[PDB]
Design a protein around this ligand. Structure first.
Ligand SMILES: Cc1ncc(COP(=O)(O)O)c(CN)c1O
Ligand SMILES: Cc1ncc(COP(=O)(O)O)c(CN)c1O
Ligand SMILES: [Ca+2]
Ligand SMILES: [Ca+2]
Ligand SMILES: [Cl-]
Ligand SMILES: [Cl-]
Lengths: 369, 369
């Protein structure tokens, strides 16, 4: 029973089917000026449209990348380096993915003033902090749409109203696309990170959606693909799969989200029956697929081990920077179990989790001094 | 009939077969600490071994990337930024791929002294130039193993002897792996770029092989995968395909090279029967898969168009920086046709090319004033 979807997902069989013809039969380079080239270019353009449409991104351009990490690097470093003449103050949430944090830290070494936005006890960013700390030399703000570790949905719409026409807003939507509504006009994104595999597309591809008139400096240099912003011969099969994923997700995500919510709530209601159990992240303003719970007197790693031994895959998340930002003590954060759900989970999976987990907690507590 | 293999290749059916299980069934993240994670990690390690073995790279480490462009960026910018305290003089060949040149140009903006190595009339780099221009503050030299446009094989072994224990040698081997012998001990590479699709693996993956004790600064920042040098969740299916490609290439490349040579020589012998036809690149020290010819009074683009119309895919290569570096005039470089061969070419393809091409040249010349 697999409850580790936020670490990796399976490629939907429908997506694979769409990809395969581009591997072997129609394998052209989109830059080539012959019929094989043309078909590849047409496939890429299509795929590009399907990704844009998913997030209502007609007001900007999709840039294909090798995944969310590269796209986050491009958003943070690409925008900041390109726009540094307008100011060098940057605001980054304390609970961002490391593929946003470490680029921010790189910019600190390049002379940018990076100020981290604190979060409250459920991991919600402090919007009054952003309003207070916003300056005329603030050029960029990065706040994730939601947190993939503790599930909390961020108030990005409220943030966008604070930042309107003063600083660019980068929103990492890796955890939210296909889970909750992601409309770059509603949330006011200027840049939006998207992961292919998080919507059951192929690994190894993703995108940064960039709003019209937002200028970036490329990170990857070369033959000038992606209109100069991201060089390298197009990975047409992965792009096509990503496109198919996006189209499928546009049609199916609302139903899937409700199904996952149903399984999530079953898990949470019952797991919290365990003595001295605690939910991490917001209990309602929360991704449909996320259950993050900690247990007194226990190590998360041993839960994960015990669950593995019983054929259940899970995660725990140097303790998590996210949990520490919410104010957990070292000992509290060490007892954390992360169950993340997905397209192929069943009621039987949840039955199985719920039959095993209470005894796992009991045994590990028997061991605590 | 497809003669544009250096723009894109088909994925070998055997490679696809190896990849597929990791798409849907065994889809774990190698960083995950459960059975799905373990299998993914084992697959990646294996694949990694198979790529290293192909280039005799036991004396270093394979770093997986999204392809040759990213790997070239990593080699040039990663090494240079990391080692800049030892000097900031860099030597780059005049005929390098743009995914080496544009990173070099980026470094020029960062205060590095980049000096371009000239080539002679067949595109061979001037080794006496390198010896003359090598200084105690030269930290890096980038010379491709061979040129994918004009086919010329570079004297990298001789270059390595000049540079032994004074400057790092980066060799872009994107055009050579699987065509000619690539042994990083024989050619003295400190960093070696490898492309997956160039050996009929999946697009969207490649590697930089890095010799032990060579230090690089990462370009892509995040979760610290690839031992910190290249962050991002592993694209396990593409890595596995790359690995399979490498294993297959180790076994089959010598036979394939001879077959391609046989087809190449047929083409060259007969195409040069055309009046005022000229081979570009060295006629013997040349990749088995490369035919680059120009024709007086003609535009390469119209040849390519005419060939497309007859169901033959080819290429022409702001004129090519490679051809201009060899000293061609604008008008000469504009008349260039690039036929690149591959695993699936047949004698019938060559028959077809040779039946069509002479009449194509005649018609286009009828049009010249
Ligand atoms: C010799 C050489 N170097 C590297 C590259 C870059 O490869 P890619 O566009 O697949 O990233 C190319 C272009 N196919 C090449 O032929
Ligand atoms: C919210 C979030 N941001 C982006 C990433 C980076 O994704 P990847 O490792 O696939 O590049 C992750 C890690 N899965 C994530 O969950
Ligand atoms: Ca603006
Ligand atoms: Ca050394
Ligand atoms: Cl909160
Ligand atoms: Cl020469």
């Amino acid at each position: 029973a697999y409850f580790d979807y936020t670490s990796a997902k399976p490629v939907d069989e429908r997506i694979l089917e769409a990809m395969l013809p581009y591997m072997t039969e129609s394998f052209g380079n989109p830059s080539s000026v012959h019929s094989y080239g043309f078909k590849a270019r047409e496939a890429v353009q299509e795929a590009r449209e399907k990704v844009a449409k998913l997030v209502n991104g007609g007001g900007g351009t999709v840039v294909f990348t090798s995944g969310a990490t590269e796209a986050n690097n491009l958003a943070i470093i690409g925008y900041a380096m390109r726009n540094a003449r307008k100011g060098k103050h940057i605001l980054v949430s304390a609970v961002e993915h490391m593929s946003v944090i470490n680029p921010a830290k790189f910019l600190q070494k390049q002379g940018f003033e990076v100020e981290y936005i604190p979060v409250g006890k459920y991991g919600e960013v402090d919007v009054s902090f952003i309003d207070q700390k916003l300056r005329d030399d603030t050029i960029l703000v990065s706040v994730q749409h939601a947190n993939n570790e503790i599930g909390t949905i961020q108030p990005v719409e409220e943030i966008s109203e604070v930042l309107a026409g003063k600083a660019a807003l980068h929103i990492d939507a890796t955890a939210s696309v296909g889970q909750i509504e992601v409309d770059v006009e509603k949330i006011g994104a200027d840049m939006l990170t998207i992961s292919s595999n998080k919507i059951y597309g192929p690994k190894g591809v993703g995108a940064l959606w960039i709003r019209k008139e937002a200028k970036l400096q490329p990170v990857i240099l070369g033959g000038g693909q992606e209109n100069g912003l991201r060089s390298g011969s197009e990975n047409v099969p992965s792009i096509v799969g990503f496109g198919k994923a996006a189209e499928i997700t546009a049609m199916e995500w609302r139903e899937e989200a409700e199904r996952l919510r149903r399984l999530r709530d079953r898990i949470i209601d019952n797991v919290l029956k365990i003595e001295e159990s605690y939910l991490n992240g917001h209990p309602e303003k929360r991704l449909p697929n996320n259950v993050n719970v900690r247990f007194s007197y226990i190590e998360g790693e041993s839960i994960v081990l015990s669950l593995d031994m019983a054929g259940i895959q899970a995660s725990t998340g140097q303790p998590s920077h996210v949990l520490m930002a919410c104010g957990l003590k070292h000992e509290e954060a060490h007892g954390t179990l992360l169950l993340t759900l997905g397209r192929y989970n069943t009621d039987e999976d949840v039955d199985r989790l719920l039959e095993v987990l209470p005894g796992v907690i009991e045994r590990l507590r028997s061991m605590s001094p």
